[PDB]
Each structure stands twice: as structure tokens, then as C-alpha cells.
Amino acid sequence: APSYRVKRMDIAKNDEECVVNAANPRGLPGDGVCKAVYKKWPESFKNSATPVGTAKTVMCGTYPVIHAVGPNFSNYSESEGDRELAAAYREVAKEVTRLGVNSVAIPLLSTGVYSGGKDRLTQSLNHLFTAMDSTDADVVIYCRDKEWEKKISEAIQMRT
Numbered sequence: 585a586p587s588y589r590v591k592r593m594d595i596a597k598n599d600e601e602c603v604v605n606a607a608n609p610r611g612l613p614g615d616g617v618c619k620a621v622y623k624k625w626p627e628s629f630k631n632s633a634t635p636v637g638t639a640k641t642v643m644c645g646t647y648p649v650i651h652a653v654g655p656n657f658s659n660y661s662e663s664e665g666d667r668e669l670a671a672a673y674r675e676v677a678k679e680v681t682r683l684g685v686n687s688v689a690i691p692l693l694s695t696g697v698y699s700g701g702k703d704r705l706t707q708s709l710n711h712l713f714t715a716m717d718s719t720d721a722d723v724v725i726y727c728r729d730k731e732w733e734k735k736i737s738e739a740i741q742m743r744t
């Protein structure tokens with residue numbers, strides 16, 4: 585029976601069958617999640633560019649890296665940003681299904697330097713649930729903060 589879990593650790597050390605990179609539309613290495621991700625799967629960045637609100641899979645050997653591009657809320661209106669964030673997660677669910685994986689390691693898109701300086705834990709996590717609820721995969725959400733870990737865990741436990 586597929587589950588949602590949260591882990592406070594480096595997504596580059598995930599124990600899942602594939603990883604979602606919080607990517608930029610240029611397909612460039614970047615910093616944060618994208619940094620450790622670039623260092624662990626650099627060959628996954630070959631032709632990894634995909635537009636805001638989309639996801640693109642690049643294989644690193646047989647290990648799929650799903651480059652998902654959340655909106656930078658600095659650049660987007662709240663309404664248009666929300667739509668692009670929902671869309672990015674929809675494309676992640678499609679890739680996860682197409683790959684036939686049993687599990688996926690995923691960050692909360694648009695919650696760091698793309699957040700526009702605002703707390704988007706609930707906004708981002710709800711878009712993640714909406715997309716991934718139609719999939720068969722175990723989902724492991726990776727965060728770095730302790731508080732965020734607690735809140736994500738509570739939101740997971742609240743649905744069951």
C-alpha cells in the first residue's frame with residue numbers, strides 16, 4: 585500500500601528508485617538541492633532544460649532524474665505561479681507513472697530561492713498530494729528544516 589513519508593536529509597542520499605530535481609528552466613547546475621543533485625548525477629544534466637511548469641526525465645545510467653521546474657514566485661503573480669506549481673507536480677506524476685518506479689524522492693518545489701520570500705510549505709505540499717495521489721509509488725518528501733519536517737509529517741498523518 586503506497587505511503588507518503590518525510591525525511592530531513594540530503595535528497596542526493598535518497599533510498600528511492602528515482603529523484604526529482606528542483607530544476608531551473610535553463611537546465612543549469614544551480615545551488616541548493618540542484619547542487620548536491622548535480623554532484624551526484626551530473627550526466628543527468630545533459631539536455632535537462634525544460635520550461636517552468638514542466639518536468640523532464642534524464643537517465644543517469646538506469647537511475648531516473650526527473651528535472652521539475654517550479655515557478656520563481658519573484659517573477660510570477662500569485663495566481664499564475666500557483667498554476668505553474670500545480671502543473672510541475674502534474675508532470676512529475678506523469679514521469680513517475682511512465683518510468684514504472686515503485687518509489688520517488690521529491691522536494692517541495694518553489695519553497696526556497698523560488699519562494700518569493702514567502703512560506704509555501706502548505707501550497708507546495710498540497711499540489712504534490714493532488715498530483716501523486718493518482719500514482720502507485722511510495723513518495724518520500726525531503727526537507728532540511730526541523731519545523732518543516734514536523735509540519736509535513738502532521739499533514740501526511742492528517743489525511744490517513
Ligand SMILES: O=C(O)c1nc(=O)[nH]c2ccccc12
Nearest residue numbers: 606607654694695696697698
Ligand atoms: O525554491 C525551490 O525549492 C526551487 N524550486 C524549483 O522548482 N526550482 C528551483 C530552481 C533553483 C533553485 C530553487 C528552486
